[PDB]
Scaffold this active site. Structure first.
Site, PDB file in Angstrom:
ATOM      1  N   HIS A  33      41.421  39.267  40.850  1.00 35.24           N
ATOM      2  CA  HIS A  33      41.625  39.279  39.405  1.00 35.24           C
ATOM      3  C   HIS A  33      42.466  40.474  38.980  1.00 35.24           C
ATOM      4  O   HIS A  33      43.393  40.335  38.172  1.00 35.24           O
ATOM      5  CB  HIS A  33      40.277  39.295  38.684  1.00 35.24           C
ATOM      6  CG  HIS A  33      39.373  38.165  39.062  1.00 35.24           C
ATOM      7  ND1 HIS A  33      39.273  37.011  38.314  1.00 35.24           N
ATOM      8  CD2 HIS A  33      38.526  38.011  40.106  1.00 35.24           C
ATOM      9  CE1 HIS A  33      38.405  36.195  38.882  1.00 35.24           C
ATOM     10  NE2 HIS A  33      37.937  36.777  39.972  1.00 35.24           N
ATOM     11  N   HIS A  41      32.215  44.527  42.701  1.00 28.52           N
ATOM     12  CA  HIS A  41      33.328  45.263  43.287  1.00 28.52           C
ATOM     13  C   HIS A  41      33.029  46.753  43.193  1.00 28.52           C
ATOM     14  O   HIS A  41      32.133  47.184  42.464  1.00 28.52           O
ATOM     15  CB  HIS A  41      34.653  44.936  42.593  1.00 28.52           C
ATOM     16  CG  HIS A  41      35.381  43.776  43.194  1.00 28.52           C
ATOM     17  ND1 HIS A  41      35.969  43.830  44.440  1.00 28.52           N
ATOM     18  CD2 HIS A  41      35.623  42.532  42.720  1.00 28.52           C
ATOM     19  CE1 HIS A  41      36.538  42.668  44.707  1.00 28.52           C
ATOM     20  NE2 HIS A  41      36.342  41.863  43.679  1.00 28.52           N
TER      21      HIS A  41
END
Length: 352
Positions: free
Chosen positions: A119, A176
């Site tokens: 992303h 993440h």
């Protein structure tokens, strides 16, 4: 090297815990940001608008997105990334202290290596391309250069705000680490800067597109088989994802590790076919090309019809049929937007 990795992971876990404790009212906003940041938007809504407003910008955007995703896939295979939501319950770093408490959301249990971020890479590349293109196009303001400096400041502030929100979305959700999104943003910027000095892609024959697609396909599959034959584990994240997730329903098993690759190659090949087709050279490059209402109608139709068409999902019961149908489905979006809708509109409102 182990000490540095452990310290980096600890900093990531601490940041996630701080964000989750102190900002419990931003859950819906962060989920919405993570949903918006997908690359499907960059292929379905962002591309038609910029292509029909400035063709070079749209072509550059599509090329940057495709190459960034390809590099992301290959380096995801190589780099052996990690994720926080099983590292917190897996490592022995917190044996002597109290384990931090983090919450898992229905969009946090994922399968696959944790580096590099996808992303962040996609958003960084696409939005850098858009900002640079807009600044280059609007360099003719009739003002004493104060308004242009203000526009520079505002556009860069907006770009950095978008990047910051995307970076925080993947940290709050415990999916993440901070370095895994910082590196992704830097790599996206690097790729978007590199494709600013390649002028051989705006007018390229179908042979070049076919050869590039074939080379990418062959290199990807050859590298996959070479890694498989060299005694390298490629299925290791699935065990951790299915072991450490809170409930055995959020995890999604795909067993098709060639979906994103085929979708990207299909989009690239569809753009290649559309650019060299007769419909594009007749309708989009004829008389009704400089008239704003035609372009606006093309944008509106290419948004509505593509969004309606996106509801079709290929079957996943046969692997080869799934791959072929995914390729043909991803090859339609550029082939639709560039060629079919403009041709139909020109025929409809060009025969009085």
């Amino acid at each position: 090297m182990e000490e540095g990795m452990n310290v980096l992971h600890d900093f990531g876990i601490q940041s996630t815990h701080y964000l989750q404790v102190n900002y419990q009212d931003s859950q819906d906003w962060f989920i919405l940001v993570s949903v918006i940041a997908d690359l499907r938007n960059a292929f379905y809504v962002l591309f038609p608008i910029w292509f029909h407003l400035q063709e070079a910008v749209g072509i550059k955007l599509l090329w940057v997105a495709v190459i960034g995703d390809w590099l992301n896939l290959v380096f995801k295979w190589i780099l052996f990334g990690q994720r926080p939501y099983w590292w917190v319950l897996d490592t022995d770093y917190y044996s002597n202290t109290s384990v931090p408490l983090i919450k898992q959301f229905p969009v946090t249990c994922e399968t696959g290596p944790g580096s590099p971020s996808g992303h962040a890479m996609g958003t960084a590349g696409v939005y850098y391309v858009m900002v640079t293109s807009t600044l280059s196009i609007f360099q003719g303001k009739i003002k004493p250069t104060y308004r242009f400096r203000c526009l520079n400041v505002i556009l860069w502030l907006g770009f950095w705000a978008v990047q910051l929100n995307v970076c925080l979305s993947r940290i709050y959700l415990a999916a993440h680490f901070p370095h895994q999104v910082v590196a992704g943003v830097l790599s996206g910027i690097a790729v978007a800067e590199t494709f600013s000095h390649i002028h051989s892609i705006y007018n390229a024959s179908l042979k070049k597109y076919f050869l590039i697609t074939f080379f990418l396909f062959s290199f990807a599959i050859g590298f996959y088989l070479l890694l498989k034959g060299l005694g390298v584990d490629l299925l290791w994240t699935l065990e951790k994802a299915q072991r450490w997730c809170e409930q055995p329903e959020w995890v999604h098993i795909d067993t098709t590790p060639f979906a994103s690759l085929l979708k990207n190659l299909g989009t690239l090949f569809g753009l290649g076919l559309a650019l060299n087709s007769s419909m594009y050279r007749e309708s989009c490059k004829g008389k009704l090309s400089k008239w704003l209402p035609f372009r606006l109608s093309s944008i509106v139709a290419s948004l509505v019809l593509l969004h309606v068409f996106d509801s079709l999902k290929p079957p996943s019961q046969v692997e080869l049929v799934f791959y072929v149908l995914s390729f043909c489905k991803s090859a339609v979006v550029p082939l639709a937007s560039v060629s079919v809708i403009p041709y139909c509109l020109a025929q409809v409102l060009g025969q009085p």
